[PDB]
């Protein structure tokens, strides 16, 4: 039906607009950019004026 074809087009647009793989890739890229590791020393003396 014409209404069904329009609904299929809207669903394709929604699937394009609702990926979340880009969000997952951005989160992974941010984590890789961070690359953290701490607590090896007990009293990390953050002495500042």
């Amino acid at each position: 039906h014409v209404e069904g074809q329009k609904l299929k087009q809207d669903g394709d647009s929604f699937r394009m607009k609702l990926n979340t793989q880009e969000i997952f890739d951005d989160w992974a890229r941010k984590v890789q950019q961070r690359n953290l590791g701490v607590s090896g020393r007990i009293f990390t003396i953050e002495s500042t004026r």
């Binding site: 020393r41 009293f43 003396i45 002495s47």
Partner: peptide
């Protein structure tokens, strides 16, 4: 009778503790 002389109970200052800590941090 050995009046007083009870060792003068005292401790290092907080600034002194921080300074010894800074020396240890240099030594860390």
């Amino acid at each position: 009778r050995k009046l007083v002389h009870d060792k003068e109970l005292a401790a290092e200052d907080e600034q002194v503790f921080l300074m010894k800590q800074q020396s240890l941090l240099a030594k860390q």
